[PDB]
Structure formats: structure tokens, C-alpha cells
Design a protein around this nucleic acid. Structure first.
Length: 49
DNA sequence: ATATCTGACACGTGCCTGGAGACTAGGGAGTAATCCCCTTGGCGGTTAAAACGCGGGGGACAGCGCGTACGTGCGTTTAAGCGGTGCTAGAGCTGTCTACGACCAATTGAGCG
């Protein structure tokens, strides 16, 4: 469902934030977002100030 | 029955440990020149080596006796907790002086006459 929404939103040109609960889920989201070369950034609480 | 508790279970950031990248420039690795060394090896004043004849004393008893062992008495030993509360390291920060850097003199080793 997320991939069809990101292809929807990328075709429309809108800027998007993705929220998740788990850092292990954010790893999965990042490996997807890298694989589809979407451009990506992450700021888990283990990121430095 | 109910309030609310003790996991479940996770991502918050702290700390330091611990890795790999790109730089200088300290120093390691490559080399002759050449000397001076570890090493080979004959020389005879000096002591390892073993008898004979021999001196110093090692050896095996008998038993006396100044000390040594057991293991309980009895009064002196440390144990023991937990009161107060001064010491004690943390640790935060100077406030410099002290040992370690930067520039160049008295004294030394090398050259051979």
C-alpha cells in the first residue's frame, strides 16, 4: 500500500513525511526506499543532536 | 470485586570503546667504505690427573638427662552490632612553575703527522 501511495505522491510532486513506531521497521522502510531510489533521510532517536 | 501492580520489550540519549580514512614527516630500510673482529691456531710455565704411604677423623654404640611433647584449666582474649560523625575522594578549578620545547655556546672525537 505504501509503494502505490509513494508512486501516487511522486507523480503528483508532493513532499512526504513517513512515521513509524519501530527502529527495526524504519530499517525495512529504508531498505525499500533505497531499493526504489526515492531519496531518503532518517532521524531515529539513536541519531546524534 | 477491585485498586493497581510488575512485567514486556519497546526506542529515548548518555557514556566510552573502538575502526578506518587522508595527511605530514619521522624514521625505517637499502647500501658502500672500511675497519676492526670473532675467530683460527702454535707456544711450554703452569696445574688437572691419578697412585703409595699415611694423618685426620668418620663411624656405631650405651645411656644420662635439659628439654620436648600432650590437651585441660580458668580468666583473659577478641567477637559482635550499630549509635554518632570526621574523614575522605570526587571533582570543579584555578594559578601558576616546573619540566619540557627552541636558539646557540665549551668541550669532545677524528685525522695523521
Amino acid at each position: 500500500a505504501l509503494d502505490v501511495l509513494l508512486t501516487r505522491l511522486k507523480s503528483q510532486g508532493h513532499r512526504v513525511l513517513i512515521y513509524s513506531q519501530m527502529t527495526r521497521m524504519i530499517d525495512l522502510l529504508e531498505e525499500y526506499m533505497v531499493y526504489r531510489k526515492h531519496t531518503y533521510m532518517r532521524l531515529d532517536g539513536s541519531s546524534k543532536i
